[PDB]
């Protein structure tokens, strides 16, 4: 997380940390608990190549990484079939947990939006994660979960910004309709934040607007953060995750 502060213990109970085996179960991506048996993440974290599940664990909402870990096994990885790369699109995935989580005050699910939700500029949105604090700059120990309020930008406006100082033809779309834009040069998500949630307050409820996907650098001029538009893939998500 570029810019922003350390999250309070209470806030973002749906926040998960994806881990990879090695000298320790290291953090590499984030995700959100959307159901007691399901976690929503970005496809690039776990694909397009097939991954060994022995090499993956999920860690539920805790303030700091590794200090009070209880690693949960994953039973299935479901990557959107249309996914190849982040810039192409469909950078969305689901992890089915081997055991259902017992939801509480500190650990519970995030609400997905209705399809009709557009998430226009002005909305008060926040992105959360344990990723890079700046370009090629890791989050230092004790690894606190970080939060940053990011400004929503319209897709065509964002697309136009992405063309500034680029050879790419103006008629050639960069920000695709399954994507969403948020951030500036001071506030943004970064490498390691991927799969994490972009949540916005809509009529007193936190709805996951987006999934941290990609972007050129971190908090770079005319390069806002690009997130997967959750509304776009609701039907796919709900093919696997119980509606409730």
């Amino acid at each position, epitope marked *: 997380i570029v810019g922003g502060q350390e999250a309070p213990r209470s806030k973002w109970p749906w926040q998960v940390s994806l881990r990879v085996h090695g000298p320790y*179960w290291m953090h590499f991506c984030g995700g959100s608990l959307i159901h007691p048996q399901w976690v929503l993440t970005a496809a690039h974290c776990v694909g397009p190549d097939v991954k060994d*599940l022995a090499a993956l664990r999920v860690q539920l909402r805790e303030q700091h990484l590794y200090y009070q*870990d*209880q*690693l*949960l096994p994953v039973s299935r990885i479901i990557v959107h079939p249309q996914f190849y790369t982040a810039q192409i699109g469909a950078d969305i995935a689901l992890l089915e947990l081997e055991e259902p989580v017992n939801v509480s005050s500190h650990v519970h699910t995030v609400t997905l939006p209705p399809a009709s939700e557009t998430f226009p500029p002005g909305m008060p949105c926040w992105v959360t994660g344990w990723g890079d604090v700046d370009n090629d700059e890791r989050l230092p120990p004790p690894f606190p979960l970080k939060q940053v309020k990011v400004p929503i930008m319209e897709n065509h406006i964002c697309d136009a910004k992405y063309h500034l100082g680029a050879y790419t033809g103006d008629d050639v779309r960069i920000v695709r309709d399954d994507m969403l834009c948020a951030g500036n040069t001071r506030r943004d998500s970064c490498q390691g934040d991927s799969g994490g949630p972009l949540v916005c307050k809509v009529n007193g409820t936190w709805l996951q607007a987006g999934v941290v996907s990609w972007g050129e650098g971190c908090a770079q001029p005319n390069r806002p953060g690009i997130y997967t538009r959750v509304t776009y893939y609701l039907d796919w998500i709900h093919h696997y995750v119980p509606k409730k």
Partner: antibody
Amino acid sequence: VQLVESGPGLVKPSETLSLTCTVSRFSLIGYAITWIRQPPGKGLEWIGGISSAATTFYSSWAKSRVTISVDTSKNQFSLKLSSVTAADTAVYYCARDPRGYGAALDRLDLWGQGTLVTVSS
Amino acid sequence: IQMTQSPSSLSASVGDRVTITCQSIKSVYNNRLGWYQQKPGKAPKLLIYETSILTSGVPSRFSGSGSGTDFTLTISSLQPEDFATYYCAGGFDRSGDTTFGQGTKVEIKR
């Protein structure tokens, strides 16, 4: 990488056999340990297991008389089998599920050397 | 137990192709089917896991195939060291419905 079963070789009937599965100079934090037994001349039988998230799963038989636990500080896993009979005389194995499952059997990558437990007066 | 191994025991010459089948009435959960080799007075060894994936170091003569309710362990060219008891083991759910197959004793023919 080594898994080691430790415990009494001889147990008198009606008593409780307590075994420990130790782990040498290797992490084991995100993993699951299951206990398997093998009566002499017979085949493999699952007792139960503990998940990556410290969740216990026990087989159809045993459920009632079996307890599996973790002492992270000691890097140990326990197995406690109460009210033993000569039917419990077997070779006891502890094995690892690298996916940290707890109720799996299909991917027990690391195994202990096995410990013979004889139930006799 | 719901894991039927066939045959219970077999005898084959060195270099012969050996096929051991593991079948169930309920379908395997998530390709959750592994093959074990147990040499006398030794702990079982995982050879094949998740139906077809070969454990590193295990010779290429060992291959696993199948889906749902019918699976097969294949030994393309049987070696004298390959005599052992092979057990398949599968999972039908994530909460306790897992068993072992009765085992198959493979013996070298002379």
